[PDB]
């Protein structure tokens, strides 16, 4: 509904390859009352 909701969570982890087999919720971080019809996304590159 014209709202971008971005929810973030940080966890100290030590497992190497797969996703940890544990459970933890996700608290909301930012609400974005802005309306766009985005259908694709890309991740920036780093050096």
């Amino acid at each position: 509904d014209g709202y971008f909701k971005i929810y973030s969570k940080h966890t100290p982890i030590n497992l190497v390859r797969g996703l940890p087999q544990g459970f933890s919720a996700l608290e909301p971080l930012v609400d974005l009352p802005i309306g766009i019809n985005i259908t694709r996304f890309q991740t920036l590159h780093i050096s």
């Binding site: 509904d1 014209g2 309306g35 019809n37």
Partner: protein
């Protein structure tokens, strides 16, 4: 004044709570516009008298 303008043609309706600023020709018939109005392609955007 002709600064008050609106879109009359569109493919379908609109979802709630959004703004469309698509300034493109609309296909008003079986004739494909292909970037040229010609026939069966009227500009959906026009002003008011």
């Amino acid at each position: 004044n002709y600064n008050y303008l609106y879109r009359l043609f569109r493919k379908s309706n609109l979802k709630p709570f959004e703004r469309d600023i698509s300034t493109e020709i609309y296909q008003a018939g079986s004739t494909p516009c292909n970037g040229v109005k010609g026939f069966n392609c009227y500009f959906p955007l026009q002003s008011y008298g």
